[PDB]
């Protein structure tokens, strides 16, 4: 999945 704030991986 992806963090909505920075696009990095969760």
């Amino acid at each position, epitope marked *: 999945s992806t*963090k*909505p*704030s*920075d*696009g*990095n991986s969760t």
Partner: antibody, heavy 121, light 109 residues
């Protein structure tokens, strides 16, 4: 020095445009989400804009959407904030801030010293 | 709209006292919370994240308890460099970030 350095502040007239820059040094800028946070004189911190590590998915607080654009040039390790029409309420110190990639709450772990924008006639 | 509110707005303490700040925040993305510290004329800095688990350079006398919409920061044995203003901060799925209004800790006398 692991740091962020904001520039572009100064006195500007309401209705004019402005471009702030933030120069990153000492870390891998292209691995981090980045943000702008401002502080009006005598007031608390207000988050205004954020962007993904790759320059996509720029997002804003409601009161600046359509007026502010956050953007980045990863080849030059620089973050930008464009304001297309300034309002008196935009007077503030503007900080650029780095987001921690590993925490799921958006966390700002590195701040510049800020640049003062004074909107006045 | 999203609201993040801190209580009290200000508090005084002696060097060595124990201090607790409250943060009430519209439910966020992760039920964690962040605290920042700012001194007059200076830039804010990250103090502690309730999401962290490594040790970090945090001097550890700071504790961030809570979850949901209700959080606290506690300073056991306040030290001179701790007099400052403290902000809590939440993040959201819109996405967005939101700072509380701040709590100023000043020197009691």
């Amino acid at each position: 020095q692991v740091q962020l350095v904001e520039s572009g502040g100064g006195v500007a007239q309401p209705g004019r445009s402005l471009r702030l820059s933030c120069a990153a040094s000492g870390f891998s800028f292209s691995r981090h989400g980045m943000h702008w946070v401002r502080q009006a004189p005598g007031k608390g911190l207000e988050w205004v804009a954020g962007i993904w590590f790759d320059g996509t998915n720029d997002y804003y607080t409601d009161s600046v959407k359509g007026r502010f654009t956050i953007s980045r040039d990863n080849s030059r390790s620089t973050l930008y904030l464009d304001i297309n029409s300034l309002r008196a309420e935009d007077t503030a110190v503007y900080y650029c801030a780095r987001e921690d990639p590993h925490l799921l709450i958006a966390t700002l772990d590195l701040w510049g010293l800020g640049t003062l924008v004074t909107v006045s006639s | 709209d999203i609201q993040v509110t801190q209580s009290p707005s200000s508090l005084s303490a002696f060097v060595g006292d124990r201090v607790t700040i409250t943060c009430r925040a519209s439910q966020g993305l992760t039920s964690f919370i962040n605290w920042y510290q700012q001194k007059p004329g200076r830039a804010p800095k990250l103090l502690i994240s309730s999401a962290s688990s490594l040790q970090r350079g945090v001097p550890s006398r700071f504790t961030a308890s809570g979850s949901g919409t209700h959080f606290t920061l506690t300073i056991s044995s306040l030290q001179p460099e701790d007099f400052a203003t403290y902000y809590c901060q939440q993040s959201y799925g819109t996405p967005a970030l939101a700072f509380g209004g701040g709590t100023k800790v000043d020197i009691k006398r």
